[PDB]
Amino acid sequence: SKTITLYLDPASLPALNQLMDFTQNNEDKTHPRIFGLSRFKIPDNIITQYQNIHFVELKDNRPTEALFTILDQYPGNIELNIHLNIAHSVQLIRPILAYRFKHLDRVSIQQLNLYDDGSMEYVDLEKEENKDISAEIKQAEKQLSHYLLTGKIKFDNPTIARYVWQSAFPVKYHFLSTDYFEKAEFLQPLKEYLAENYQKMDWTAYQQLTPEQQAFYLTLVGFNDEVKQSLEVQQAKFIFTGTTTWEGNTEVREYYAQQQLNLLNHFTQAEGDLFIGDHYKIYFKGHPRGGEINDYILNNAKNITNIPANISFEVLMMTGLLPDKVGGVASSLYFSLPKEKISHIIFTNNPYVKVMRRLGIIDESQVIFWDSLKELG
Ligand SMILES: CC(=O)N[C@@H]1[C@@H](O)[C@@H](F)[C@@](OP(=O)(O)OC[C@H]2O[C@@H](n3ccc(N)nc3=O)[C@H](O)[C@@H]2O)(C(=O)O)O[C@H]1[C@@H](O)[C@H](O)CO
Numbered sequence: 001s002k003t004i005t006l007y008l009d010p011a012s013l014p015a016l017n018q019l020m021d022f023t024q025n026n027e028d029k030t031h032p033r034i035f036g037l038s039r040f041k042i043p044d045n046i047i048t049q050y051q052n053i054h055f056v057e058l059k060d061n062r063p064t065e066a067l068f069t070i071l072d073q074y075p076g077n078i079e080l081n082i083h084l085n086i087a088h089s090v091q092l093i094r095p096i097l098a099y100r101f102k103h104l105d106r107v108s109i110q111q112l113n114l115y116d117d118g119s120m121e122y123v124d125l126e127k128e129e130n131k132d133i134s135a136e137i138k139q140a141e142k143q144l145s146h147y148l149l150t151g152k153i154k155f156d157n158p159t160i161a162r163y164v165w166q167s168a169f170p171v172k173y174h175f176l177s178t179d180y181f182e183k184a185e186f187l188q189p190l191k192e193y194l195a196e197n198y199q200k201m202d203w204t205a206y207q208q209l210t211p212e213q214q215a216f217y218l219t220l221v222g223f224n225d226e227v228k229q230s231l232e233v234q235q236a237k238f239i240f241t242g243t244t245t246w247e248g249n250t251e252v253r254e255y256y257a258q259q260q261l262n263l264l265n266h267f268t269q270a271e272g273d274l275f276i277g278d279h280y281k282i283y284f285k286g287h288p289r290g291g292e293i294n295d296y297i298l299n300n301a302k303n304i305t306n307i308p309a310n311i312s313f314e315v316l317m318m319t320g321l322l323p324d325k326v327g328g329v330a331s332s333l334y335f336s337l338p339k340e341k342i343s344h345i346i347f348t349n350n351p352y353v354k355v356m357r358r359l360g361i362i363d364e365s366q367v368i369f370w371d372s373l374k375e376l377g
């Protein structure tokens with residue numbers, strides 16, 4: 001029996017966790033690993049120190065068939081330790097199961113490790129508030145059984161379908177927010193159902209690595225000393241955080257970057273509605289997929305130090321380089337951001353709002369919206 005480990009994720013959070021897992025095991029230079037990480041590129045130098053390390057592309061939330069050629073290379077009885085992104089867990093496992101059916105005799109699933117895509121699971125879960133959770137579960141179990149037995153996907157409730165994997169494999173979830181599952185009364189049935197198969201993402205796990213591994217991890221998440229240094233200055237610092245849109249329409253995209261830029265000013269300008277004072281060193285932490293959006297801020301802002309968008313915000317917390325204040329559009333990094341560092345959360349009633357509230361990330365006060373801010377200048 002050989003154990004192949006798969007790390008798959010099209011987003012950020014999962015990847016950050018999966019690579020942390022990988023780091024914790026970097027002593028084992030020859031364990032068969034398959035990385036399917038869209039937002040992270042493992043540096044060659046790290047690659048050449050490992051054996052039986054493969055890479056697979058992701059398309060439409062699923063590993064391409066290149067994954068099959070990989071598996072083909074291991075003829076013995078193999079067991080799969082799969083790490084997946086919760087939100088797209090059903091699609092991400094599709095070709096794994098497909099290949100499995102082509103080899104029931106040899107291939108088997110050892111266990112699953114699922115991680116939150118980000119805020120989506122929570123926004124999506126908030127939309128299931130008036131439903132019979134208990135019923136929803138059983139319904140989902142049965143449909144997963146159908147999926148596992150036919151290779152066919154058909155879920156009445158896609159959101160709930162994400163949390164019924166225990167009915168088929170040994171699994172452990174890692175939640176961006178365990179508080180949400182314990183504070184949303186309407187979720188009790190899912191809470192209880194999940195019983196002991198879950199835990200909170202451990203953000204202090206980097207502190208437990210040996211310094212060498214820490215450097216190693218930092219290498220994976222693309223954190224360099226140059227950036228490390230732009231954060232060394234003893235001056236009080238403020239990190240404007242960016243967001244983005246998935247819409248292609250040039251119109252909606254330009255509007256986003258224009259709203260964001262303007263929001264940036266309400267923070268930094270003295271007549272801004274969100275003015276935080278004038279002694280802070282401003283920095284920009286654009287969304288990873290910011291693209292033209294991130295460029296806009298840098299091309300029209302003044303004295304601001306850019307923090308490479310490909311670096312996930314949670315890394316500043318691990319390396320203790322967190323600033324005094326953070327402000328911008330709502331996104332997943334605020335779910336794990338030390339309370340006292342919150343300057344203000346702006347949104348683009350509203351589910352995302354309800355989640356922030358249930359979690360106490362924001363107070364009872366009037367939530368601020370993108371467009372309620374006057375154009376400055
Ligand atoms: C509801 C919904 O669909 N939420 C998703 C969420 O499940 C996930 F898909 C993601 O996560 P998102 O919350 O933005 O943030 C996720 C992580 O990405 C890195 N980050 C993000 C912004 C930034 N300015 N600096 C950073 O460094 C951090 O690691 C952070 O914790 C995502 O794109 O990965 O995007 C949002 C979308 O709402 C999109 O943001 C808005 O249309």
Ligand SMILES: OC[C@H]1O[C@@H](O[C@H]2[C@H](O)[C@@H](O)[C@H](O)O[C@@H]2CO)[C@H](O)[C@@H](O)[C@H]1O
Pocket residue numbers: 010011012087088117120246
């Ligand atoms: O990148 C991970 C991220 O993808 C989001 O989906 C986007 C996709 O990335 C983009 O290329 C396409 O044009 O639009 C999709 C949304 O309609 C997921 O929603 C998010 O959860 C992550 O998986």
